[PDB]
Amino acid sequence: MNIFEMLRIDEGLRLKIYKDTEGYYTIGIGHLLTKSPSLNAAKSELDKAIGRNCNGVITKDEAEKLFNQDVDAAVRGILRNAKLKPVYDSLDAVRRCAAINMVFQMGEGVAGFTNSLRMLQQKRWDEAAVNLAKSRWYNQTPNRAKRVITTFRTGTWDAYKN
Numbered sequence: 728m729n730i731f732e733m734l735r736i737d738e739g740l741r742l743k744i745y746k747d748t749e750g751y752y753t754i755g756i757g758h759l760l761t762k763s764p765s766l767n768a769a770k771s772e773l774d775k776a777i778g779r780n781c782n783g784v785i786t787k788d789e790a791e792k793l794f795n796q797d798v799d800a801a802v803r804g805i806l807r808n809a810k811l812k813p814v815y816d817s818l819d820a821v822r823r824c825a826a827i828n829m830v831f832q833m834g835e836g837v838a839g840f841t842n843s844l845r846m847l848q849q850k851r852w853d854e855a856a857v858n859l860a861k862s863r864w865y866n867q868t869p870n871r872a873k874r875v876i877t878t879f880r881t882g883t884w885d886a887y888k889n
């Protein structure tokens with residue numbers, strides 16, 4: 728298991744524009760297109776992202792390329808963020824995947840997790856897991872949040888093999 732396999736499980740793969748759990752136009756492996764209610768606005772974002780006139784549909788290769796870019800953008804954003812980088816650098820590789828997963832889903836949205844981040848940096852895993860669940864994130868996407876939290880709690884891939 729690695730971050731790509733983990734997020735592919737959590738996000739799925741759809742080749743036509745769909746709506747995410749918040750109702751926002753998305754495509755591929757969880758690539759947000761726009762928060763605007765305009766499907767035309769979403770289609771414009773898609774064409775700009777892919778570099779051709781897509782009509783709201785992409786190939787698997789294109790979805791995977793966008794996904795690689797999106798994962799990289801999450802990582803580089805963590806590394807540029809003075810709050811997130813020290814915590815990220817304190818984690819082992821499996822827990823770093825859980826961190827990238829959260830940033831991918833909510834963006835640098837993670838700003839409200841100051842207390843969780845402190846517990847993670849202190850390696851107080853059970854306490855961090857309890858704190859992470861006291862969130863809109865957990866209440867709105869509980870199965871995905873439970874998998875990510877279990878990854879932080881245990882440092883294993885058990886939630887994704889199960």
Ligand SMILES: Fc1ccc(Br)cc1
Nearest residue numbers: 805811812814815826
């Ligand atoms: F760098 C980090 C980003 C997000 C989390 Br959650 C933990 C560390």
